[PDB]
Symmetry: none
Subunit: 398 residues, 4 copies
């Protein structure tokens, strides 16, 4: 049924693997709510010659932020968390900040879309200001290779609380991870329980059993190794790192199946609202339809790094549908997030299917494609390959 | 036929054994009423270099409660026992109890689901009260290492009969073992025959030949040895213990085939009703379907320790199947009981198969999977391994 | 080289095994200081079908007295122990005992040959008196089945310290085991260290690398089971017992090679004195010849139970050499000790070779035969079989 | 040819592995200069299910001292090193030290046999002094979990240079690893080349191609993982550590074939002296016989921790050949060194064969047994197992 798109997808995977040089890569493609392809090429452990399998466990670096949003959404739906109020209500430990001698409010909504003025692994404000001015017209950092073990989010707040702001909140978009550490602290304070157990409950609800936080001591089966090329153009192991300070922003281990399930749940929650009118035998989504349409609504004055046409909206990169000129390029609406860490690259992409008159009456949610790719290599851009694979699978729907 | 599934299961057995440090482990799997795999890994007797075999005899700790429950169900079907009436009807030797100076009644139905006020190896009321209060928001005990031999069931009642109750009956779930000793006294009084003799007949009916109570003087072939780790992390023998005071609670020795037979009989008795209508050539089950449905009917205000999703139902752990949201986790119905004795651990799991229109018309009972695992290592959790093995075998049904 | 004697002794082994139905038996025969035969017939573990082998470990009951005697003799040679001083000098915990209102003295020498008034598993002052009078003219005791664990010897002395003397010390022979507990306490006092670690050093000196004390907790490889026959004439297991209160008297584990080595050392120490003048390159024995000749010197008014011809001589049974009439029975000089415990029986026998003027000049010690037999059946007499095997192997000396 | 020996050796290995619950174990045996058995039992990588093979690379902790002794002996034979002069000739950075205000000399010979006053992972002088005084009548220390990287030995000396001595040099034995760090510094100074380059030259000369220093970045094929048991008696991973500060003392990775080759070279160097008269076509040893006899000569007032009978002799444990009494224990001459690291244990043993006049003319060196055992479990003593395996292989010599 899908014997043609599989070969093209494998060819594209070989293309990207050969161009980059990654020792291993794993892909998972799910169509219409069911997993239809899982593949792994290369070695998960070069030293011991362990081949890549669909149950290989790797690092999802920036995709974790998306998961955080879900938790926040749940805390929003119960009404326990309000986006408008300043963040000092929940966490007094965060000092009151001032910009150019005036009071400026820092809110949860600003943190979610990276509209505050928190820094991102950089301290020289002049370089950041010059970069932003040039734009208007990162692996060399030392904080990336921290080794200290932090007990909780409060202990990790000390890394950036004393630094001054870089821009007036709500005015300039600056991608940063410490804002999501603050978000995790807010989640801990508002929920009343620890962040890790809340995330574990969410994982249990969504049926993502393999997902877990990265730690050295526990024994985690099928854990992959991470590699990088050195100055002499030779493969070597990345330095040992500890990610206990950025749980919500950069630390989580998972396979492709869990990401496929997460994408399918998001797609069903998004699309069930339209089908609800036709039939009443459909189960409710995980989140309310208003929350789901709030997540994927682009926020103005934002940039999305991995494709120029997109905009950033609630830990997601959303590309809308438009055709400004006749017989010209027709943009396809989709939502993707890309993650990169020390010796690890990943992409999660959701391509919803456009709905017609008969589709809403006859078909059943979900209707779309989810593509997840993970490789144990550093500084690899996987968005375009995922988009091409999704389009290839979408071409021959039936 | 079942090559891949068997290989996967073997790896899972190795993984649990390696992490725990268990010297030996035995597994048995039954599919649709026939035995498809039995295996043993390691040594049953470390000192004499005796390997583990599918016919190794080991301890079962809390699975004896299932057999006592089967005896009680047979007596109830025969009409000689009433669940509602107070236990003073059968055993007057149990003193009348008075909680907070008010009259309370102790009934068999309460003892069955651990909802009475009987203690469990703990004699300080304040510790239990504070633990239960915290819960609202045992291998160190001396009674577990008794050596005195008890001739009959009435003698063993003096351990706990004089002690007061801990909670009001029917309000708090307190997992206890002495309740089943009192149940054994009830069975002995009502049936007119000794508990061991009646249980021998019940075992004979089910073809459970190797099952027998644990005693020192008789010669029992293929008996395994039980071990534990000391403060220096070196394997050692457990102390000599006399389990005669809890015959109905934890004093039986059995192989994996006997547990497979018991599980298959339970599954057939559960499932015969649906197939009875289509085909009239089927033999009656060991118990009536009205008793079998009550057997696996979860009770409110009860907790299943080995899985947070299930509840307690007539000396069993039951996990009902439900799906709250679309594209989200769906539970699968199964019944499991786990036991942990001094030096041994065991698990028995029954996974019934959902039935469709085609299956009912043509196929015959029983339809399901029964998995039994035993290891001679103390404090080992095995329920998850059994569930994973059962799910692995389920996929390659045809 | 010994083909005839091997078969002729295997015949006697089968005879003695069939006569009592012992499940297993092990024999070791050494001639001229070299182990020439080691055999095992039957099953060491009936339940798990473990065949007997020469490295099987079984209980030795009264040979522990012969082992403690080496420690006592070594302490005496070191000058730290005095045989004639009252034992109250070493152990004041023992009270001053009085016989019929007259002062009496208890010494080490009286305790060596059971000439004191210490009782033995019998608490009736009268019951033993008529038995002793009839003689002049104990498996049913509960003391043999004690389960308490004793940490040090002084605690273990509490079982008999308050009881009065049965006879005037030094006048009546009464085989007792508590006297050797008192001797172990005396060794504790004089040596200044523990009893068990002193015997460990002695065993290490003699190359007996598998002679350890019997405890349940440690893992002991190749350990064997012990059986008995009940009133219905069926094979059953002996009850679990603890021998911690009679380490020096009735509790140790060993193989047959250890007993062979111990006997070889004793024989060499007994015989090197004569060969000393012939050759000066002979190493000294573990004990001086003056101590060895006193070791095997019979004591008046002492009875050797397992052979009516001999007498008791410093924890050994010795039969001398004599010929009263011409062409009549000619006694042979030999030393043997027999041990019987709960579920096991054993014998060790040393038969020295008569030497002429030629052999002393031409031969090198040791010159004799050592035979050790152990069977796991309660209350079996084994002295006669050992003596007959020793004579058969003496027949084919070279 | 060695089937019985192989079977018996396999069983012993099984017993130790079961006792300590080691995930994996590798053994290598060389008989008379040839390798006859190389076996692996268990898993090298528990997480990824990688079985142990002879070509597994594990940690050697204390054998690196035995490897550094070869470099020191080679330098001594070259005439570029003096054992008597104080070390400050080569390393002025090490300060002159005072014990109770009297001049003391720190020489190479004292540090070779751990006779100086240098400490070992312990800073409290009072505790060490009390322990030594008690004896007259290390995996919990923080320094063992260092993560800092040291470029060269000169800066690595800063950890202990300012700490005064604990005992007067040449008077008390104190096992330490920092003394060999100073020895590595002395080797760097006197050789005129870097320590690691000289060690690589030696490894190339001895055909030990797989022996390399432990570095995280380089890709080392067949590298294993190292495990421990936590408080909950569950298998976990050891923390990340760095051993760059004790290159010569505790950091090196090697297989079992390399250790067998090293032992063969040492044995040939030790035994080539006797056979030189019988045949003149034998190649010279790696070291002069006068060097080898000095190396394996026990030093007075030194204690061998893993064997009470032997004594420490120039980075080795040597047991003397002696027999005090007749028909008693006869000691056997052998050299053994045991190394324990964080999550790894290893042992290397050499057993020479006693030679007579008729053996020299016909046989050729080497004549002995070399046994190497490596396991990835923390704090395992493998000396006795290696000795038993060596003796079992010695019984079936021809």
């Amino acid at each position: 049924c899908f014997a043609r798109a599989i070969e093209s997808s494998r060819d594209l995977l070989h293309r990207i693997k050969d161009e980059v040089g990654a020792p291993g890569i794993v892909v998972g493609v799910s169509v219409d709510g069911k997993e239809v392809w899982s593949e792994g090429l290369g070695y998960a452990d070069v030293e011991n010659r362990v081949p890549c399998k669909p149950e290989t466990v790797m690092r999802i670096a920036s995709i974790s932020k998306s998961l955080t949003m879900v938790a926040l959404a749940k805390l929003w739906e119960a009404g326990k968390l309000d986006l408008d109020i300043p963040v000092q209500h929940y966490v007094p430990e965060f000092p009151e900040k001032e910009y150019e001698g005036e009071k400026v409010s820092v809110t949860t909504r600003l943190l979610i879309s990276h509209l505050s003025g928190i820094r991102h692994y950089e301290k020289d404000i002049k370089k950041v200001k010059e970069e932003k001015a040039y734009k208007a017209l990162d692996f060399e950092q030392g904080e990336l290779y921290l080794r200290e073990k932090f007990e909780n989010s409060i202990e990790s707040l000390r890394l950036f609380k004393n630094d001054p702001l870089f821009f007036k909140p709500g005015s300039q978009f600056l991608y940063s991870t410490f804002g999501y550490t603050l978000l995790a602290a807010i989640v801990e304070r508002a929920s009343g329980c620890k962040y890790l157990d809340y995330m574990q409950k969410i994982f249990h609800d969504l049926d993502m059993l393999t997902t877990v936080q990265e730690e050295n001591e526990p024994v985690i089966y099928n854990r992959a190794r991470f590699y990088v090329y050195n100055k002499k153009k030779r493969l070597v192991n990345t330095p040992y790192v500890d990610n206990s300070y950025k749980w919500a922003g950069g630390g989580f281990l998972s396979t492709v199946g869990d990401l496929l399930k997460f994408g399918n749940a998001m797609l069903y929650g998004y699309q069930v609202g339209l089908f609800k009118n036709s039939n009443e035998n459909l189960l409710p989504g995980y989140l309310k339809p208003e929350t789901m349409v709030m997540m994927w609504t682009p926020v103005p004055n934002t940039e999305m790094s991995w494709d120029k046409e997109g905009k950033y909206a609630m830990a997601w990169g959303v590309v809308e549908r438009k055709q400004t000129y006749g017989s010209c390029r027709k943009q396809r609406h989709y939502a993707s997030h890309t993650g990169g860490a020390v010796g690890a690259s990943s992409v999660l992409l959701v391509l919803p299917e456009e709905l017609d008159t008969e589709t809403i009456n006859n078909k059943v949610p979900p209707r779309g494609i989810i593509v997840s790719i993970i490789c144990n290599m550093q500084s690899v851009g996987l968005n375009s390959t995922a988009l091409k694979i999704a389009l290839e699978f979408d071409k021959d729907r039936s």
